[PDB]
A paper describes a structure:
The crystal structure of Hjc_15-6 was determined to 2.5 Å resolution using the selenomethionine single-wavelength anomalous dispersion method. The putative active-site residues in the proposed motif E10-SD39–40-EVK53–55, except for residue 39, agree with archaeal Hj-resolving enzymes, as predicted by others. Moreover, this signature is situated within the most conservative part of Hjc_15-6, where the putative active-site residue Glu10 (motif I) is located in α-helix 1, Asp40 (motif II) in β-sheet 2 and Glu53 and Lys55 (motif III) in β-sheet 3. However, Ser39 prior to Asp40 (motif II) is not shown to be part of β-sheet 2. This may be due to the gap between residues 30 and 37, which are not seen in any chain in the two models. The electron-density map of Hjc_15-6 suggested that each monomer has two bound sulfate or phosphate groups with full occupancy. In addition, there are two further sulfate- or phosphate-binding sites in both monomers that have an occupancy of 0.5 and/or have high B values. Based on the observations above, we may conclude that Hjc_15-6 has a typical archaeal endonuclease fold and a dimer organization that resembles those of other archaeal Hj-resolving enzymes.
Numbering used by the authors:
A (entry chain B): 5 to 29, 39 to 90, 98, 100 to 150
B (entry chain A): 5 to 28, 39 to 85, 98, 100 to 149
Write the structure that this text describes.
């Protein structure tokens, strides 16, 4: 009931070596370079419902100061999807979950798309492997 | 190395039924389902913590905060110690706080808005 995907994202981040946890308030927290960051979690049933249809083939890319990528992707990298700016709602990281059947042909094995500020990309990469 | 008292406060809060932790304002506490930074200060004497005249007054409300032992204006050192956070935890040796009712040595400085959510978590 919504917490399901927040817990899934927390376990996926903890598997990749991140210190992550859940805060009901409906938010997720992550440690990047020794700093706590709020992660907004959105789940949509289809790429159209998440305004990601034209996005999927472009990942990873940088747009309006954000790096947008599939959760497991480490490959080298415009307006941004209007629904996404509203979804950030104060937080700086956004995690969008789609069914894996939609993301997987494009390389998104887990179904998650991470919208992260460009300032945080260096720290995010140095918290894996 | 300063982390000893943050861990002590986290265990004391978890004992009283709070969801508290130290991040790898290093302490976080969950009040009514909301995450709050807790600033931790440890001082060797009541004078070093600007608490000499405070100890006999606890518990009280001053400048919009409820000041009490863990279990009128506020000291100027304390406003600077909050430094952006909204909750402040001051630790003194128990020998100083105990004759006044502070068995643990901790003084909590909590906003009046959070007093209702703090009470209903014990």
């Amino acid at each position: 009931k919504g917490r399901r995907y927040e817990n899934e994202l927390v376990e996926l981040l903890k598997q990749r070596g991140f210190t992550a946890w859940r805060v009901p308030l409906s938010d997720v927290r992550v440690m990047l370079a020794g700093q706590e960051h709020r992660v907004e979690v959105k789940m949509r049933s289809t790429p159209q419902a998440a305004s990601a249809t034209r996005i999927l083939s472009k990942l990873p890319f940088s747009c309006q100061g954000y790096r947008v990528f599939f959760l497991e992707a480490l490959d080298s990298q415009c307006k941004l999807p209007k629904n996404w700016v509203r979804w950030l709602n104060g937080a700086h990281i956004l995690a969008v979950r789609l069914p894996k059947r939609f993301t997987s042909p494009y390389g998104g094995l887990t179904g998650w798309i991470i919208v992260l500020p460009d300032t945080l990309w260096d720290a995010w990469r140095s918290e894996m492997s």
